[PDB]
Amino acid sequence: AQNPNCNIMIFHPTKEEFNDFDKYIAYMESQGAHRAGLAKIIPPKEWKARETYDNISEILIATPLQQVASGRAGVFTQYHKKKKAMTVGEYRHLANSKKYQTPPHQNFEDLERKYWKNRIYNSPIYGADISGSLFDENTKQWNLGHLGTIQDLLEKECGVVIEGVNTPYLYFGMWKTTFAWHTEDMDLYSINYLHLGEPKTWYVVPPEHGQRLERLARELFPGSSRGCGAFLRHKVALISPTVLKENGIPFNRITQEAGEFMVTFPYGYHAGFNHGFNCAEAINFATPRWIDYGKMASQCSCGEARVTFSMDAFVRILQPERYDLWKRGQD
Numbered sequence: 001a002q003n004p005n006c007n008i009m010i011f012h013p014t015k016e017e018f019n020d021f022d023k024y025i026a027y028m029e030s031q032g033a034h035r036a037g038l039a040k041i042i043p044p045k046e047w048k049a050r051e052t053y054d055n056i057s058e059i060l061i062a063t064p065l066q067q068v069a070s071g072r073a074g075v076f077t078q079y080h081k082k083k084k085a086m087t088v089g090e091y092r093h094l095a096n097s098k099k100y101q102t103p104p105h106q107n108f109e110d111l112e113r114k115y116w117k118n119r120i121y122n123s124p125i126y127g128a129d130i131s132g133s134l135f136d137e138n139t140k141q142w143n144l145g146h147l148g149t150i151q152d153l154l155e156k157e158c159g160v161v162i163e164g165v166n167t168p169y170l171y172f173g174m175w176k177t178t179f180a181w182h183t184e185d186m187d188l189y190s191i192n193y194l195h196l197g198e199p200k201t202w203y204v205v206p207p208e209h210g211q212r213l214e215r216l217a218r219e220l221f222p223g224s225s226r227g228c229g230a231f232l233r234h235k236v237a238l239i240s241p242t243v244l245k246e247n248g249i250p251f252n253r254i255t256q257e258a259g260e261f262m263v264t265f266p267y268g269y270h271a272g273f274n275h276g277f278n279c280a281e282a283i284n285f286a287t288p289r290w291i292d293y294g295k296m297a298s299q300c301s302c303g304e305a306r307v308t309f310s311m312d313a314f315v316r317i318l319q320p321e322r323y324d325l326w327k328r329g330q331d
């Protein structure tokens, strides 16, 4: 069995290997990359996402989200308070202000220590989930707006044509902006490209151990767990690496830098934080190996998780027994 300790693997494809996206994902899986839940892909030196980032300041962040924490430093939830619209140039200036800027630090490990010590005492503002793309249309390799769609994959594998679309999303971050513990909708893959700026630190639980994280989360968030049998779908709970280690939960960590891709694999729980002002692009995707995970994915039906239009068909076709209850949660 390849990668039996479920370590995060880092890949350096050549320009020739960067042509065929599906083939390279399958290659990484042949080497055991999925067992970690997360892999890093460093593009060949010949590749670029676009020519420059000098002209992005006028993108609008219609609904910036202030991430307010509750709990203790290592075990907390966050809620998202909506703020007034602002441009990317306005948000960059805000991120660099004395109130929000990255503190002085020695290295990524020092900054990580500072994040976990102090995150709860601040409320950073995240420009998340903005439909759009920063890949140039002429970038032919690993262009996250030109991937095979999940609807087409389901149709290819299972024969059923379904409605829905699959487009990327932009994320503008600042110091301490946080992504809570989650797997993807319908336990899909995700791919995330860090276009510019400061790093993003990731934590991940191997897919084979995801239920250990779920059991800990039910213990640590007992009111939330009574409210919903899949409350991590709400994307609000944080647990620190120190608490995971105290409770014996297997996990790994890695820092993504500008110019790097990360892939999350089906049922790979992940969480993390941004080091400072940055911009990432991410999208969900599927392969043949995903279908069995999609069929088994948990679902939130309490009403909180509320998701995209295109999840309806995935539930309807892959999980017909759960469909009626899930759709009630959507309405």
Ligand SMILES: O=C(O)CNC(=O)C(=O)O
Binding pocket: 171, 178, 179, 190, 191, 192, 200, 264, 270, 280, 282, 283
């Ligand atoms: O970058 C973020 O805030 C969150 N990203 C992801 O969870 C992802 O790419 O799957």
Ligand SMILES: [Mg+2]
Binding pocket: 055, 056, 057, 058, 059
């Ligand atoms: Mg612009």
Ligand code: NI
Binding pocket: 182, 183, 184, 190, 264, 270
């Ligand atoms: Ni994710």
Ligand SMILES: [Zn+2]
Binding pocket: 227, 228, 229, 230, 231, 233, 234, 300, 301, 302, 303, 304, 305
């Ligand atoms: Zn729920």
